[PDB]
Amino acid sequence: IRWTYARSANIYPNFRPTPKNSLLGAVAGFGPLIFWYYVFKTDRDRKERLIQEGKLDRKFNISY
Amino acid sequence: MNPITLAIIYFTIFLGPVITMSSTNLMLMWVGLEFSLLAIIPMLINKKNPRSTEAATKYFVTQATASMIILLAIVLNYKQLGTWMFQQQTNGLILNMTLMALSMKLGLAPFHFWLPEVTQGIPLHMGLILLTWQKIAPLSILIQIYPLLNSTIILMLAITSIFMGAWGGLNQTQMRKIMAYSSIAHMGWMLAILPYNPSLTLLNLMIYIILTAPMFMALMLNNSMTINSISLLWNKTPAMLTMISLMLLSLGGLPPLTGFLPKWIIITELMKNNCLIMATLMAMMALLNLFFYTRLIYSTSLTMFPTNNNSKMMTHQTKTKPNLMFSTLAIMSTMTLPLAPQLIT
Amino acid sequence: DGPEKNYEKTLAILQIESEKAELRLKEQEVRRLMRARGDGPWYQFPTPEKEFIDHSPKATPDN
Amino acid sequence: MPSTFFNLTMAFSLSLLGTLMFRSHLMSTLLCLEGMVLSLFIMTSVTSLNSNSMSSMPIPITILVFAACEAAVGLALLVKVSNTYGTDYVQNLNLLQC
Amino acid sequence: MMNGRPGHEPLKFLPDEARSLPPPKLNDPRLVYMGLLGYCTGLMDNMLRMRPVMRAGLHRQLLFVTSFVFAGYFYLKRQNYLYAVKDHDMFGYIKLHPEDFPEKEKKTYAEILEPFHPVR
Amino acid sequence: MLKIILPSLMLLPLTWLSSPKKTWTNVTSYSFLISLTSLTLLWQTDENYKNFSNMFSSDPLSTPLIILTAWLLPLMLMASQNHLKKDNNVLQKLYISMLISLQILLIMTFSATELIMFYILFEATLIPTLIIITRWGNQTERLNAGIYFLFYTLIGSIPLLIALILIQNHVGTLNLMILSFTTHTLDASWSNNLLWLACMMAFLIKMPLYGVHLWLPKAHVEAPIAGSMILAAILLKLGSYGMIRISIILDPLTKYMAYPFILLSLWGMIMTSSICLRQTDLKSLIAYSSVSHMALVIASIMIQTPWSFMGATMLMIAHGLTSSLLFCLANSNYERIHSRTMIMARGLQMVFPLMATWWLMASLANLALPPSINLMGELFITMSLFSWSNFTIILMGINIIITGMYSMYMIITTQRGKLTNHMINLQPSHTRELTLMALHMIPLILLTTSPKLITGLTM
Amino acid sequence: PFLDIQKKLGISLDRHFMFLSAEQPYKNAARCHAFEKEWIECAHGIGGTRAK
Amino acid sequence: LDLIWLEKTIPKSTSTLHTNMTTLTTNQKGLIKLYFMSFLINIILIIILYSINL
Amino acid sequence: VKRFFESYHEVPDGTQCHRKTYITTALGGICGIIGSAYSVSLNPADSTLEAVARVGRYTFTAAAIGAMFGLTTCVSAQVREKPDDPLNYFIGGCAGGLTLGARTHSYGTAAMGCVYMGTAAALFKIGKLEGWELFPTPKV
Ligand SMILES: CCCCCCCCCCCCCCCCCC(=O)OC[C@H](COP(=O)([O-])OCC[N+](C)(C)C)OC(=O)CCCCCCCCCCCCCCCCC
Ligand SMILES: CCCCCCCCCCCCCCCCCC(=O)OC[C@H](COP(=O)(O)OCCN)OC(=O)CCCCCCCCCCCCCCCCC
């Protein structure tokens, strides 16, 4: 019971914001988001430029 | 009080707002406000305690200052136009004098600092008749001059009224003060919809009155002035918990309760007149109002606070206190949303 | 019953809803125009009553 | 008449400023209230006499009667304050904040 | 907003012109709901006065239902008159001001060029 | 739709007039008949939508949700009948009344043809969930869970109300079919972006999106079993139905305004699956699994492919059934042991072999075992997301791997292993709870057998 | 007024001295009687907006 | 991400904001002298706002 | 002063940067004077000296908020060469929030002020660009 309480209902009572966990929470909550945003944005703009320029070929792609 | 002075004081309390609404002369509306204030003062002072003395004194000085500002504006309009009505070309300064004085009379922020002050210290029937009956006459005066007033000052007063009402009702515990800040927020909604559609102002006033009256009556059932005092209601009268929950949710504006209808139709008309920003801000402050209502619901109904040993005596005794008028108003203030086209005009 | 009943019921529903939408838009336009320049039944703000003016000859002839 | 009415309005404004700006005496606050009452009487009477409005001549008597009943009720409340707390200092009436 | 219309006789619940309107059919969902609210009011009153909820005060419950149906019927008649006169004033103003409400020559889906936004 | 709404309405006087020794039997039987009556909406022999009246309408998307709600209510009553046995008759009838009110309002919400009525029933079904969770929850933070749930939902829903009233003022009727036919493009302005965000955020809170999902795990942990079932099986899908309805009038700026929510959904399903791995609570594990699956539904709805919509709808139905089944099994163990700790009861395969079979079947449905509708929807969401961007397969693969890990970890640590021999209070099985798992699992197999019923609007 | 009880009952409790060109004691006209009369017969019947 | 930073960011921060602001707005001393000085300030501000709006 | 407030918008963003900073500092100073008057009215100090001290402190804090708001918004718009975009106003509002947090001596207030004031400034810029009405005259 003490282990479950410490793991669940005590973390926010015993949390105090420091510079270290502020930086850690910022990077862990945003860096993956920014990274995957850039990956998907560059891929989708590449696909969009290819498909309006006409070089990308969808030979049998009708189940999009 | 003997029945002679009871009848005379109650008749003058009734007569004030009736004179104010019936009269076409600004002077006779002013004397109707005078009857209302003078007649209701002895009923506040009736219990004869220092808190009643403080409440009566603060209420008197506030209404005295507001009535003199009303009289100043009436006299200035009579000097400018030669008539006794703000017709079409009365001065905007005069109209703003009327608006500030009537906002002082109503008790909305930033003129709201006396309404919890007065509502605390007086008995619950006094808070009921104040917060319900004493606002019809100033709202009647404001409705009569609706196309001339200044929407900027009205919207600013309404915004700050609901903001401080929500924050106060968030803060304290005392039930009368809770009702006072609820009144301040609802009057903010009323005043905001006033310059565009006074019919919705009257609809909000009627919904607010039929929601505010029965829960005062439920407070008068056991004279519960405290969150804890209404929290041990389940041992005293458990048949009231469901209606208390429904009335508090309707005051919060949760659908499908009919108390959602005034806020909804007010937002509809306000967006018809394109004040999106005000509509959204007012809606968030109404959410805070719903927060302290929901906290009250948690205290009284959804949990079960510990009780005393003498509640056994209170359950042994019988009571015939709740009249037939409670249930009618509670049902008409809880289950009336599908009649919304009939309620609106 | 069949597909024609649902088809024509949907047509009736669509006609009713479209007429209601047009009526609401026209109501907003009428209310806007009437409040802007009140000349119809609505937004007729009050005026001092004509019937309470003395027309009898008075003490001063310069009236 | 314009200068007279302007200084009457300024007298009302000064009495209103005094009424809003409390000192220690609720009695002085009430006296400022009747300063406003008197300014209203004078303005209404001067306006009626200037416009020759004998139909509106009842209005000063009306405001005198109603504001005098107001003053009587306020005096009764001040009497209750003084009887409750010995003195009539307005700072004693602050136990309803909580 | 409609209080200043011509022919407005003051404080009239139901003017004679309203008698040209169809009355409610007396078994319609609004009045049925009003009767249901009256019955629920009587039941809740029985609970609050700590009586049997359905087995006590049958005359009281009948009085609640009857009064609710009566008031609902007459208020519904007034509201129907109000909506009817609102629509009549609206159509009259539209007819009287035809330059402000022009019929738009609404054109088919053969000359208008809706932009195409692919989803890919 | 009236022939389903009206007898569900008449269930409440049946509840309050039935004998205290017959009320559970009567309400359960008549609610099963309600579900059987609600099965008539699948008579869809033509492409035209079933518009029953000017107020209620049926749809290939609305129909599975209505049938799921009408089927779920008797199972809610079955699940709730045990923990209310030491309660007063008026309290039991009040609980049944709340469940029936939930059922009625959810049918009316899914069958609403008009979004203002949809919002009215949205808050209407918000209310008795609050009442159920806060009154019949067990421990002391049920009030906190109710506050978080209600205010997340209401702060989401208020700008939805403002956006709906603006849409009505701009167009004229806000009827769904009128909007779908005479929709117009949006000029990609900042006001239109704010309008889009306002009418999207309510459902995004409800589903929930990652980062605003915090109300869901506490609500499911502190809720009663019927509350957990109704939340995880209907209300998230109610949000999902919300976006599918509202998204048709938001072309074309959803193409670029869809970007942050897809990313939040993918990284959130990975994060919540990781939390399911390192979670110490079984109800919290099921709740975070629900968050991950609803994140998949979010990503599909935002990428707006027809295969995404079809996979989303099938995942809605599949996840509702399997999450309700998982909550039912967890609640059976909870009434056995009076604890929600994941590791306290370990060797339950020994003493509950049939319930271990139900556990295995539920987790196999959870980790998307083919040919079930779970993997059917998940695979079509994968196809549509890969068509949207080929790099989504990395996040999908991580999510599927962690999904298999947390499902098999739950089975291994709850059923497999040595029996905790100190748990002497392990009653063998209730026919009620075994029937509850069977009524959860059989419609999953039937929908696996015929997946055309839940393919949604597009196909 | 907000309530038209005076107009419904046909009585005139306070409507007969609203303005300067109303009834006066012993037929003594107030100042600007002609001007205010012409303003009122101008403004009558057209409403406040058209009157302004 | 759950038990520290999202909970610190959205819900507890809104609750702390509203608790601080309700303490600030309900720090009232119950003195009608201060209340009427506040009312005088309101009158001055509304007069100024009318003067600058016209 | 209404002419001052409408002379804020006579020139686009990124031009007359000193003038924009001065106007926004004046607006913040007026708001600070109003708030300080309310504070010393509702919550009187123990003596006039620290009453005037808190008036000056509140006025300087709000004036610093306005000054950093105007300077940051103008600098961002000028160096990014796009005036009619709400991101510049969001960075300016965040700078005002960090100014509030630096005066309050708390990074929590700094972050809350950043988010809230940036959002408020962004919607203010959006409303100014796209004709939102804060105080609409009754039309219907
Ligand atoms: C759960 C999330 C809650 C917060 C996010 C909600 C959505 C955010 C984006 C939308 C803006 C805010 C809601 C506006 C609702 C109406 C939208 C609309 O109609 O837009 C078009 C309208 C514009 O109307 P328009 O489109 O007619 O514009 C005029 C266009 N011409 C001139 C061409 C005709 O947008 C607005 O008016 C938006 C003004 C909003 C001002 C107030 C915002 C206050 C803060 C809101 C959130 C508060 C709760 C959260 C607090 C923090 C909690 C952690
Ligand atoms: C990634 C997406 C990002 C974008 C979306 C972000 C928004 C997500 C949705 C919003 C979530 C809000 C959550 C609100 C509930 C959590 C707060 C709470 O529960 O506070 C509890 C606390 C009172 O607790 P108490 O009962 O006193 O003690 C605990 C036990 N005894 O309460 C208090 O102390 C005060 C609580 C006040 C009421 C809180 C709920 C209403 C908030 C209204 C906000 C209005 C915003 C606009 C305001 C004007 C402009 C600034």
Tab-separated table of N, CA and C in Angstrom, chain F residues 407-459:
chain	number	residue	atom	x	y	z
F	407	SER	N	-0.295	-5.814	-22.849
F	407	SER	CA	-1.371	-6.798	-22.765
F	407	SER	C	-0.874	-8.129	-22.199
F	408	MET	N	0.219	-8.662	-22.755
F	408	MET	CA	0.760	-9.909	-22.223
F	408	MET	C	1.362	-9.746	-20.834
F	409	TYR	N	1.888	-8.565	-20.496
F	409	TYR	CA	2.357	-8.340	-19.136
F	409	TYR	C	1.203	-8.371	-18.150
F	410	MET	N	0.066	-7.781	-18.528
F	410	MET	CA	-1.119	-7.827	-17.681
F	410	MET	C	-1.597	-9.256	-17.471
F	411	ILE	N	-1.647	-10.050	-18.546
F	411	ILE	CA	-2.056	-11.452	-18.419
F	411	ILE	C	-1.088	-12.232	-17.540
F	412	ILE	N	0.215	-12.036	-17.746
F	412	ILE	CA	1.209	-12.801	-17.007
F	412	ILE	C	1.191	-12.436	-15.525
F	413	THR	N	1.066	-11.153	-15.201
F	413	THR	CA	1.111	-10.762	-13.800
F	413	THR	C	-0.233	-10.875	-13.091
F	414	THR	N	-1.339	-11.077	-13.809
F	414	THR	CA	-2.616	-11.243	-13.126
F	414	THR	C	-3.108	-12.678	-13.097
F	415	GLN	N	-2.804	-13.474	-14.116
F	415	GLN	CA	-3.252	-14.857	-14.184
F	415	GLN	C	-2.110	-15.841	-14.002
F	416	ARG	N	-1.012	-15.637	-14.721
F	416	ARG	CA	0.082	-16.589	-14.740
F	416	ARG	C	0.885	-16.488	-13.444
F	417	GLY	N	1.728	-17.484	-13.208
F	417	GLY	CA	2.611	-17.469	-12.058
F	417	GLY	C	2.036	-18.226	-10.879
F	418	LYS	N	2.767	-18.149	-9.771
F	418	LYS	CA	2.354	-18.817	-8.546
F	418	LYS	C	1.124	-18.144	-7.955
F	419	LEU	N	0.231	-18.950	-7.393
F	419	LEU	CA	-0.958	-18.417	-6.745
F	419	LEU	C	-0.589	-17.800	-5.406
F	420	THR	N	-1.123	-16.614	-5.144
F	420	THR	CA	-1.028	-16.000	-3.825
F	420	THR	C	-1.954	-16.759	-2.886
F	421	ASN	N	-1.392	-17.711	-2.140
F	421	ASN	CA	-2.190	-18.632	-1.339
F	421	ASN	C	-2.808	-17.985	-0.108
F	422	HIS	N	-2.410	-16.765	0.247
F	422	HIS	CA	-2.998	-16.101	1.401
F	422	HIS	C	-4.365	-15.500	1.107
F	423	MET	N	-4.780	-15.454	-0.159
F	423	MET	CA	-6.064	-14.863	-0.533
F	423	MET	C	-7.151	-15.918	-0.373
F	424	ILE	N	-7.549	-16.138	0.883
F	424	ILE	CA	-8.524	-17.177	1.180
F	424	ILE	C	-9.937	-16.769	0.776
F	425	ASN	N	-10.182	-15.485	0.535
F	425	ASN	CA	-11.519	-15.010	0.183
F	425	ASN	C	-11.710	-14.907	-1.326
F	426	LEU	N	-11.422	-15.986	-2.041
F	426	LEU	CA	-11.578	-16.025	-3.492
F	426	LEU	C	-12.756	-16.941	-3.807
F	427	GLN	N	-13.935	-16.343	-3.943
F	427	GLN	CA	-15.111	-17.090	-4.359
F	427	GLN	C	-14.917	-17.593	-5.786
F	428	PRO	N	-15.436	-18.795	-6.119
F	428	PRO	CA	-15.081	-19.438	-7.393
F	428	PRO	C	-15.436	-18.640	-8.636
F	429	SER	N	-16.718	-18.357	-8.845
F	429	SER	CA	-17.186	-17.543	-9.959
F	429	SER	C	-18.658	-17.265	-9.755
F	430	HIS	N	-19.098	-16.093	-10.184
F	430	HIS	CA	-20.516	-15.804	-10.266
F	430	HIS	C	-20.988	-16.072	-11.685
F	431	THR	N	-22.151	-16.716	-11.793
F	431	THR	CA	-22.789	-16.866	-13.092
F	431	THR	C	-23.093	-15.505	-13.704
F	432	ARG	N	-23.370	-14.506	-12.861
F	432	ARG	CA	-23.577	-13.143	-13.332
F	432	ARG	C	-22.333	-12.589	-14.013
F	433	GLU	N	-21.177	-12.691	-13.361
F	433	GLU	CA	-19.982	-12.092	-13.942
F	433	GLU	C	-19.481	-12.891	-15.141
F	434	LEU	N	-19.654	-14.217	-15.126
F	434	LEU	CA	-19.319	-15.010	-16.306
F	434	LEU	C	-20.225	-14.662	-17.482
F	435	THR	N	-21.519	-14.462	-17.214
F	435	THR	CA	-22.449	-14.009	-18.241
F	435	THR	C	-22.066	-12.631	-18.757
F	436	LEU	N	-21.548	-11.778	-17.875
F	436	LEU	CA	-21.123	-10.440	-18.270
F	436	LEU	C	-19.957	-10.495	-19.249
F	437	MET	N	-18.949	-11.322	-18.952
F	437	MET	CA	-17.848	-11.485	-19.905
F	437	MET	C	-18.318	-12.127	-21.205
F	438	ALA	N	-19.248	-13.082	-21.126
F	438	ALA	CA	-19.747	-13.728	-22.339
F	438	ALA	C	-20.518	-12.752	-23.221
F	439	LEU	N	-21.336	-11.892	-22.612
F	439	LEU	CA	-22.068	-10.881	-23.364
F	439	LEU	C	-21.161	-9.769	-23.859
F	440	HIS	N	-19.986	-9.601	-23.254
F	440	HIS	CA	-18.994	-8.721	-23.859
F	440	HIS	C	-18.338	-9.362	-25.074
F	441	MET	N	-18.003	-10.647	-24.979
F	441	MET	CA	-17.162	-11.285	-25.983
F	441	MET	C	-17.914	-11.761	-27.218
F	442	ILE	N	-19.155	-12.237	-27.069
F	442	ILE	CA	-19.882	-12.781	-28.225
F	442	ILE	C	-20.158	-11.742	-29.309
F	443	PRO	N	-20.621	-10.513	-29.015
F	443	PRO	CA	-20.733	-9.519	-30.099
F	443	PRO	C	-19.419	-9.166	-30.771
F	444	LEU	N	-18.286	-9.272	-30.070
F	444	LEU	CA	-16.996	-9.076	-30.726
F	444	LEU	C	-16.759	-10.130	-31.799
F	445	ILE	N	-17.071	-11.390	-31.490
F	445	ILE	CA	-16.914	-12.466	-32.463
F	445	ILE	C	-17.904	-12.301	-33.610
F	446	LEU	N	-19.130	-11.868	-33.306
F	446	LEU	CA	-20.124	-11.671	-34.358
F	446	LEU	C	-19.739	-10.530	-35.295
F	447	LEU	N	-19.224	-9.427	-34.748
F	447	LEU	CA	-18.780	-8.325	-35.589
F	447	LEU	C	-17.515	-8.680	-36.352
F	448	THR	N	-16.676	-9.553	-35.789
F	448	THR	CA	-15.567	-10.111	-36.551
F	448	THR	C	-16.081	-10.924	-37.730
F	449	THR	N	-17.136	-11.708	-37.504
F	449	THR	CA	-17.718	-12.522	-38.565
F	449	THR	C	-18.313	-11.655	-39.670
F	450	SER	N	-18.986	-10.567	-39.303
F	450	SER	CA	-19.569	-9.641	-40.274
F	450	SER	C	-19.098	-8.225	-39.986
F	451	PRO	N	-18.008	-7.787	-40.614
F	451	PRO	CA	-17.482	-6.444	-40.355
F	451	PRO	C	-18.122	-5.331	-41.169
F	452	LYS	N	-19.081	-5.634	-42.045
F	452	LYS	CA	-19.698	-4.601	-42.866
F	452	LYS	C	-20.642	-3.702	-42.082
F	453	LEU	N	-21.050	-4.112	-40.881
F	453	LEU	CA	-21.988	-3.323	-40.095
F	453	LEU	C	-21.349	-2.075	-39.507
F	454	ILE	N	-20.039	-2.083	-39.294
F	454	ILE	CA	-19.367	-1.011	-38.576
F	454	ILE	C	-18.388	-0.259	-39.472
F	455	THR	N	-18.534	-0.378	-40.788
F	455	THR	CA	-17.606	0.268	-41.704
F	455	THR	C	-17.828	1.770	-41.823
F	456	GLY	N	-18.888	2.307	-41.242
F	456	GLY	CA	-19.034	3.743	-41.163
F	456	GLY	C	-19.554	4.373	-42.440
F	457	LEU	N	-19.321	5.684	-42.535
F	457	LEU	CA	-19.932	6.485	-43.589
F	457	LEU	C	-19.310	6.211	-44.949
F	458	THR	N	-17.984	6.116	-45.005
F	458	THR	CA	-17.293	6.146	-46.287
F	458	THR	C	-17.444	4.841	-47.057
F	459	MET	N	-17.441	3.711	-46.363
F	459	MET	CA	-17.505	2.417	-47.030
F	459	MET	C	-17.995	1.332	-46.090
